[PDB]
């Protein structure tokens, strides 16, 4: 079959031919289409994008750090408008955001170091727990919010939401995006909601199947414009491979030197702004 | 261009031929596929579906009686195991559910005949709002749940979210449902929404743009298939007009009279069980 990555790429060249300029919050432009759609088959592959080198160590180490719940932003290695407090900023507790919704859903917070098991709901156990109950149900879904929106009080609309999907002992995932930038976001959003596929299949028992991501405002920034127009013009080579090295049982005691990327030869880095 | 209705009829064919077999929540036999999109433009026509007959006029006054925000189902003319309360049930009193959770989203509920103005989130109020503050923002957002998972304390996740987006002067829309029965509800709820935003649009000095349709488990019941095949065969007439006869200044002053379809000119009816 057709390769992939063409969808990213078509999508790429769709939104520099027909995007319309549109600002985002802080003012800066971009070319904008809204509504996308495109399907990665996870099966005996890995969208690991290869016309520019995607930096896989740091979307496995982010995941795991979500996964974890961390609110401690030195946990992970050593849009500035995510305020809020004095000496707390200091010792970067980053407040209850990120893997606090994924595993402490609505649980009031403490600070970092406090020990939040059993409180708010843990979207991930849960979603994990219904595959297991009921691989038919159509409401496995987690959701994810942008920090900035979280006074939280306020209902405040999530980030991203992923929907699972169980038939023929394959696991699917359907990311759904509110926006997404075509030129940096993205292609680590593949491997980053992928990989989290990986994960969740290995311990259920499952085989990884599709995964979709849809987007609403799909956008590319101005400046990231020509380096775009040079990375259309590269060949995907064939998707690597992604191994987990030993039998996992939760979620929980995934670490990063259980995963093995192979056959992975992309084009080179590109810089973008 | 190709005609719209296209893409609904591409997506029945294509889960004929490559649908798996899944069951649903009552055991129910279906042939699903997880991930679809269709866009469907706007702009001087509306996508009501021309190879069968729709339940226009059902359409609109259900789609009225969400905007109410009501909560008496003897409010609309005159899956059954949404079941708690004795006199309750009697009365029509549906609680805390469908419209309620647009207009008094959270707002704790007494009975049908309660008076929550100012309880609540209203998040049609919100979504209006925020297109006219600021139509840039990527937030756009509210979410409509099945009033089955509504113990609601549970975090329950949303049936369907729908996400407007504004640029050049035009409001479009995308809704994603976790699951969409194509034989049966998708038809009606592309009209409902469409309509949605030509409501939204009117009230904010918009034009209407895109709707965009997305699904997670999209699904055709078996007993569907015979007629949908019979569907299938035949060729979509050009969508209707819709005419808003009045200029008209909040969103809770629209009735039904308001409304002019014109130009619709479909295939039969076809009854699926």
């Known amino acids: 079959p057709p390769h992939g990555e063409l969808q990213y790429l078509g999508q790429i060249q769709h939104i520099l031919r027909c995007g319309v300029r549109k600002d985002d919050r802080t003012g800066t432009g971009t070319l904008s289409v809204f509504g ?7 099966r005996d592959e890995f969208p ?5 080198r995607v930096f896989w160590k740091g979307v496995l180490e982010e995941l795991l750090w979500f996964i974890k719940g961390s ?17 707390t900023r200091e010792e970067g507790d980053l407040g209850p955001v990120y893997g606090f919704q994924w595993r402490h859903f609505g649980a009031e917070y403490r600070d ?4 939040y098991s059993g409180q708010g709901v843990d979207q991930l156990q849960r979603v994990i727990d219904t595959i297991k109950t009921n691989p ?9 919010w942008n920090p900035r929106d979280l006074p939280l009080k306020a209902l405040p609309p999530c980030h991203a939401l992923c929907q699972f999907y169980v038939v023929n002992s394959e696991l699917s995932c359907q990311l759904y995006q509110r926006s997404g930038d075509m030129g940096l976001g993205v292609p680590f959003n593949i491997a980053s909601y992928a990989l989290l596929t990986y994960m969740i299949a290995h311990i259920t028992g499952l085989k990884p199947g599709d995964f979709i991501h849809t987007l609403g ?11 775009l ?11 690597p491979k992604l191994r987990i090295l030993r039998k996992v049982e939760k979620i929980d005691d995934f670490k990063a030197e259980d995963f093995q990327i192979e056959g992975y030869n992309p084009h080179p880095t590109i810089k973008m702004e």
């Open 229 to 239: 127009k040079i990375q259309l013009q590269r060949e995907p080579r064939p998707f």
């Open 136 to 144: 038919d149900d159509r409401r496995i879904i987690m959701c994810a």
């Open 48 to 52: 690991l994008l290869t016309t520019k």
């Open 36 to 42: 996308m759609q495109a399907r990665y088959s996870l």
């Open 217 to 227: 405002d799909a956008h590319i920034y101005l400046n990231h414009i020509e380096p």
């Open 112 to 115: 970092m170091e406090s020990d």
């Open 71 to 87: 609110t401690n932003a030195k946990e992970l290695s050593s849009d500035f408008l995510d305020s809020l407090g004095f000496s």
